[model samples]
Target: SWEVGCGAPVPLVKCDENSPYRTITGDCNNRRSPALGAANRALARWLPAEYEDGLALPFGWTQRKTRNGFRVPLAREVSNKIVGYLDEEGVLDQNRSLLFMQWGQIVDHDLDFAPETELGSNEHSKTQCEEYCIQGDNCFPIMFPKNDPKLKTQGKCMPFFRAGFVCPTPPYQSLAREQINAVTSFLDASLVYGSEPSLASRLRNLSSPLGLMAVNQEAWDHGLAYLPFNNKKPSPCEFINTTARVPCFLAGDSRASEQILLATAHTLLLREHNRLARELKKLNPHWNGEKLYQEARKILGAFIQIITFRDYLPIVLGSEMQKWIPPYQGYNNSVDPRISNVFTFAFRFGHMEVPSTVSRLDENYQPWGPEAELPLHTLFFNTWRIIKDGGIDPLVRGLLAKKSKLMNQKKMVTSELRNKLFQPTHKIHGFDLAAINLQRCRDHGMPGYNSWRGFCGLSQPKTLKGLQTVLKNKILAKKLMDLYKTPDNIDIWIGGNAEPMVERGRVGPLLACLLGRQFQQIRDGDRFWWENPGVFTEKQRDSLQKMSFSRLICDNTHITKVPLHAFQANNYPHDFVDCSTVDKLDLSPWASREN
Candidate 1:
């Protein structure tokens, strides 16, 4: 009877003690349980899930009201009232640059992407999730309220697919359904090199003697390389302005071409990989193609780890949150590094940092002027902009030169992001980011705001007055309580957003606690962490600590000048330094002495 539900166990794995490179899939990191943090594994949960039927149904699926006898407001209603609409002109952070936001996105992509479910028969499922107004096995479309402002005129349902299920871990007892992480949880640069074997192999430049990742030779931006094109007959990239339609750029991750800024980030890493490969080959002429490739990959992965922890996290988490992340005490095999459910939700908070305007600057560090500047909405999935325009240089300069949109309680996100996300020229309507975030959290069975507050050791309020004190914004707390009626009914994403900022951090205390703990496990649990003893020599480790985000930009791109700290926006000419002055990673430490 247990065998019926459990099914047969998967094949066993044999870990290698002498192997230098970690597997593309995250297996063998923990010898005791080979599948601990690998792709397609279930995301770990810190607290038990809060499903409606005590099993699989989403929180508000069948129940009309919450336990406190208050109706759960339509996600769309909550979005319009509390989350969406900008009351005044949005503010910009004087210190943090747009580059800060870009790094956050790149790191987020590396960590996780929860793919939607595909269940039932091929014949019956062909048109289910997208077109249907009624609920099916996997479809949980959002319904429109009668008096809604934007969508009440045209369609009733906004199509939504529930996250895919991961079930039946050992002992075969019935357990609540949980979402699967389709990517590796580690910060191993899987976004740059891919998480699985087939995709990783396909991305390699096998024909090259020097061992480099493939590039698009046909399309060059002022002698610089573009990512190779995806050859699928019907590609993901769509072109409207250009006569010649170019397919999407192929990378380790499929979402590389999701937006222009993200594509620019991918291009930098692509160039950096090939650059390192060529340099390493010169240093060790006796090395083979595979040797060069693996060594370069190892160094690039370390660069990502260093930049995130040293340059980026300090700014986002601030001084207070830093206390939670203890100095790494080396890797421990017993620690499970699988990404937790709450961490995945909290990281998406960067969606608020995305500015409505995107600037393209010239060599003078000034805008390419009004004609060249692009709105955020127009840039989504427009890979043509990267090629036809002046290329990644302008985009890179624009990010460093400008300030990131400031996020606060009054204006959580811009109108462009909230209302006009991912709309193609052919279509008049698009999706709402805020509504989607709220719906997805409930869809995945994430517990309420107070539960997470209790988990983080913060005050858990029961009444509206108590919530007002916690949020420190009397008006916003009143509005939120008015919508949900009880503080316990508040969604984690929305409630976390409303809390007052903690010191110099971008997020509130609740988010900082969850994010801090997740990153802690991610760093300390991995066997191949760059700082670990066996992974690198002391000389190499010291050299890596010198690797700065500013240096990465200087080495990879043609930008002649940049701020000493890439994440912070400073006065031009006064604070900006020539690329030559930036500290470079000494590669002499990586030289092969075996010969």
Candidate 2:
């Protein structure tokens, strides 16, 4: 039986309409729902024993509900003037709906799950595997410092799994217990920040096969010396208020020398290009600028490519000829010798002259033979002719010369000059003597000559006096001028200094004699040319005759006339000369006499 309040029997309320007149004490039943009240009492007694302890109940529990419930407060909602509850009691008892709602808001707010994003999905078992490994202490998670926006969004955390793990279980147990323990221990000791590991950490780990342990040990013993930490710091030299304190090597003035040389070279090439363009325009008056420009550009592109890549003289010269000269077309399938003769002359004189050794060789060894199919000598000469006969403007010529001279001077000390001069003509189809000299000037420093000579694409002279004498003598000057007028011939005179030419000429015969003797020994029993007399016919000889003299002259002149002073200036004095001469002698006699 239930006790009434204050030890007094209290009358029960009746649910029936006529029950109000009866006052039943203690066990009174409702007139309409007496069974319902009885059922409620039974249910209350049947409740869990834990809920019956009133003093021991959790803060939110209530007897009315007979079950745990949360006790939350609501704050007063003040509107407009917002004044309410002046007294302490009033303030305490005030409605706390807003406060309770706010508290609930905070409690219900999202807990950041960014750390989990890097682990990826468990479908691939990567996350689960990592987790298991970490649990076993075999591997640790590497946390990388997020730098990229996407990475930052994902959180700055990376996991480093231990290596040398032999999985024992089908999935989670694949890795050994020892491995797992090691990994977990590493993770525990790891210095993690943000959410991920840094690139530096990854790099350290990758630096050794034993994971980051080696990196750690190294770091503890000695700092990372290989890292480019200094690269990040602002350069002291860069921040200087004035350029005066900067070293000459780093100064703007120093850069100007190289820049000027390059600029001048580029300008000369452009001028030559324009000159060639004008000539093409004059030859084909109806052709538009676009057509002419395209052709000239194509030719120039080929020329520049050869000049840049091929160090050999013949190859460079041959490439130029192939670009400019076209094969002759004659009627009745019988080649017209006259038309072919013109092409041959252009190919030989304009671009490059074949070496005398090649000229004297048998049909099998001839430059135009099967053995020497691509004649660099022919190519160089033809290309020169095309440019010369093309009717280039004087202004363009001057500009090209200036640019060429500068470029050549800048390139002095390069090996291209030696390779070009020594390279066999048969190997390359076209060879430009003048261009070779210019290249030499760039490759081997020319003596007492300004960058302008190279910029102008002038050939080096064999002798100092040869150059001076040529410059001084009106006849030689006219001849040089005339040679320039014909681009094919200009290369012969321009390729070397006077002193070098004289010296080369003097030594040329001796060297040839030695080489010839060696050649005879090698070909003692060979008669490949004798058996193929048909290929070495009179017709071929006639065709070669027209251009043979020019070729010989060009070769002999180059060998003899390239100035010794120029050679010395180019740092090749010892290449030919045994020692330097201090005594001044009368070189004029030698100068006036031609080889």
What is the TM-score of each predicted model, taking all chains together?
Answer: 0.93, 0.15
Error of 1 at 429 (Å): 5.1
Residue 554 of candidate 1: its Cα lDDT? 86
Residue pairs that clash (backbone atoms under 3 angstroms), model 1 = none
**True-structure lDDT of candidate 1:** 0.79
lDDT of 1 by residue, 192-248 (tens): 889878888888998877778989967987777788888765554655344557667
Q: lDDT, candidate 1, residue 502?
A: 76
lDDT of 2 by residue, 1-595 (tens): 3222111111244444432111111012223223221110211111111211331222112225422132111000100001111121111101111112111111111101101112333253455433342322222322222232313433332222222211222232311111111110000101110011232133232432221211112111012111111121222221221232221111101111111112122223333344445555555656554455444443333233222222211221233322222221211112111111011111111111111111111212123224322222222212121122221122111211111111111121111121222222122221223333232221111212222234334444434345445344444434433323221222211322211211212111111222222222212211111112332234432332232211211221112211122101121122222112212211121111122
Query: Which residue runs of candidate 2 sit more than 4 Å off their true CA positions?
Result: 1-258, 312-595
- For candidate 2, give the lDDT: 0.22
